[PDB]
Amino acid sequence: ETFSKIRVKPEHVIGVTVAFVIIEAILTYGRF
Amino acid sequence: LKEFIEECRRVWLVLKKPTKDEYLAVAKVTALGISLLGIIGYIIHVPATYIKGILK
Amino acid sequence: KKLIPILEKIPEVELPVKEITFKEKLKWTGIVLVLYFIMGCIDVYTAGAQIPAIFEFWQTITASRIGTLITLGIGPIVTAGIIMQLLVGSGIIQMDLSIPENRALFQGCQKLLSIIMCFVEAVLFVGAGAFGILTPLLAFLVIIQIAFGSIILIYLDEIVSKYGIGSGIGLFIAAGVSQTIFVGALGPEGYLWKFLNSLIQGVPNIEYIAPIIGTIIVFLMVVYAECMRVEIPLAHGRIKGAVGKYPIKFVYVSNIPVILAAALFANIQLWGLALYRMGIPILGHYEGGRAVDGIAYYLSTPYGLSSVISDPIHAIVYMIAMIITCVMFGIFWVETTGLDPKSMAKRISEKAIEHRLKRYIPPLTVMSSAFVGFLATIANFIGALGGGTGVLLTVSIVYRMYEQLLRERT
């Protein structure tokens, strides 16, 4: 087990990730 | 100092050559998987590349 | 233990509320795989469309794809592993590790060191000029992106490790290699297609099929090693005929030693290229490509098509380092994991068995590492679409995954 006092749900992680991909996809390939 | 180099020879003699039957087993299971992963990574990479470049 | 406050500070995926069906473990595995793949398709934001070729070495071990969201792939995590292993493993740090307290700290402290290395390697990466235009802002921006893509990979890793099949470090490495083999063979610039044309124009440019050959060779070879076993006799001296033999996998130490080393080596070249074009070229001197001088030189690996026969001195010294290193990490690994006699005992009166193991485990350890280390180098000498060390790790990664499908099949 671990000492971490904050547990996050798997879906959350997936989410964040998706956010990151979408935002970055925009940033870079937004130029038209 | 040399007692080690000895025990090695011991286990080195307990080396059971692979049953061609088993070899093909692991050979087909691994190769099959690499394709699974590979095919997937291709289905994504190729089209995304096509695009990034067509738009660029 | 004086880090416990910090450990509590770091987030950590929730263990599954209840058991999860293999069906799900897959779907979970699948998603992280697909996310990983998509992440390698997005470049980092850099107003300036440019990058000085690529450090043809950092990617394979790292499951990375430089110039993108996953430019540091798994580097951070592994590099972190290298450290924790050296420190604890040798003795520079005492830890029973059979008692939770220890593991908790160990495990969690690696998890922290990895999150750290994300920026460390991100800084190091940008410094080494993987990008070029060091405009303090854009530079900070990239480091940030780079670092964060890896932090994600650390967490996705955890997801597989709790809701999926195998591990993240594993998935990613394999996934990267596998994709590479396939795109570089059957992609639109596919060697395999190129070769064919030449087999229709009577001018076969071997250089188009050679690498695919290597892949095939290295493959078969690595599979073989994955089939080697040791048959422990069981001639219960009771009655005549009450004999048997319990075969066990030969690569007792497993293939972990290959990543750990290959990783350490790769790191050494990054840090070196960094300290070089910064100040003191300590670890070596690099030029239009990489280091052609220094320890960094003597830890590089020439391949990606065929067998280079220009400087065999480099090869013999490299192979020496590879083998010893593999063994070093091999030992430590066996110690820190639970493959040591001391522990094995409990599982399998005590010293009876324990002392007997102490008779054979050690030599299997060194023999295994050494073996794979050799196998690694020869794989690299041959060169192959994928990496050799890559195809190496992959073959085994894939397999161990399959096994876990069986023990999870029940």
From Swiss-Prot, chain B:
Keyword Cell cycle appears in the UniProt entry: no
The protein, known as: Protein translocase subunit SecE
GO CC list: plasma membrane
Membrane topology: Single-pass membrane protein
GO biological process, alphabetically ordered: intracellular protein transmembrane transport; protein secretion; protein targeting
Residue ranges annotated as Cytoplasmic topological domain: 1-25
Alphabetically ordered keywords of this record: Cell membrane, Membrane, Protein transport, Translocation, Transmembrane, Transmembrane helix, Transport
Record's function text: Essential subunit of the protein translocation channel SecYEG. Clamps together the 2 halves of SecY. May contact the channel plug during translocation.
Complete-protein stretch covered: 12 to 67 of 74
Lineage: Archaea, Methanobacteriati, Methanobacteriota, Methanomada group, Methanococci
Subunit structure: Component of the Sec protein translocase complex. Heterotrimer consisting of alpha (SecY), beta (SecG) and gamma (SecE) subunits. The heterotrimers can form oligomers, although 1 heterotrimer is thought to be able to translocate proteins. Interacts with the ribosome. May interact with SecDF, and other proteins may be involved.
Top-level taxon of origin: Archaea
Transmembrane segments: 26-51
Molecular-function GO terms, alphabetical: protein transmembrane transporter activity
Swiss-Prot record, chain C:
Segments on the Cytoplasmic face: 1-27, 88-109, 161-167, 227-254, 331-369
Extracellular side: 46-54, 129-139, 191-208, 277-311, 385
Gene Ontology biological process terms from the UniProt entry: SRP-dependent cotranslational protein targeting to membrane, translocation
InterPro entries: SecY (IPR026593), SecY/SEC61-alpha (IPR002208), SecY_CS (IPR030659), SecY_dom_sf (IPR023201), Translocon_Sec61/SecY_plug_dom (IPR019561)
Gene3D superfamilies assigned: SecY subunit domain
Segment forming the signal sequence: none
Any GO MF annotation of the entry: signal sequence binding
Intramembrane segments: 55-62, 63-68, 69-87
Transmembrane parts of this sequence: 28-45, 55-87, 110-128, 140-160, 168-190, 209-226, 255-276, 312-330, 370-384, 386-399
SUPFAM superfamilies, per the entry: Preprotein translocase SecY subunit
Keyword annotations from UniProtKB, A to Z: Cell membrane, Membrane, Protein transport, Translocation, Transmembrane, Transmembrane helix, Transport
PROSITE patterns listed in its UniProt record: SECY_1, SECY_2
Magnesium as UniProt keyword: no
Pfam hit, one: SecY
Site (Pore ring): 74, 78, 173, 178, 259, 393
GO CC annotations, alphabetized: plasma membrane
Cellular compartments annotated: Cell membrane
Function: The central subunit of the protein translocation channel SecYEG. Consists of two halves formed by TMs 1-5 and 6-10. These two domains form a lateral gate at the front which open onto the bilayer between TMs 2 and 7, and are clamped together by SecE at the back. The channel is closed by both a pore ring composed of hydrophobic SecY resides and a short helix (helix 2A) on the extracellular side of the membrane which forms a plug. The plug probably moves laterally to allow the channel to open. The ring and the pore may move independently.
Quaternary data: Component of the Sec protein translocase complex. Heterotrimer consisting of alpha (SecY), beta (SecG) and gamma (SecE) subunits. The heterotrimers can form oligomers, although 1 heterotrimer is thought to be able to translocate proteins. Interacts with the ribosome. May interact with SecDF, and other proteins may be involved.
Family from the record: Belongs to the SecY/SEC61-alpha family.
Protein name: Protein translocase subunit SecY
Species: Methanocaldococcus jannaschii (strain ATCC 43067 / DSM 2661 / JAL-1 / JCM 10045 / NBRC 100440) (Methanococcus jannaschii)
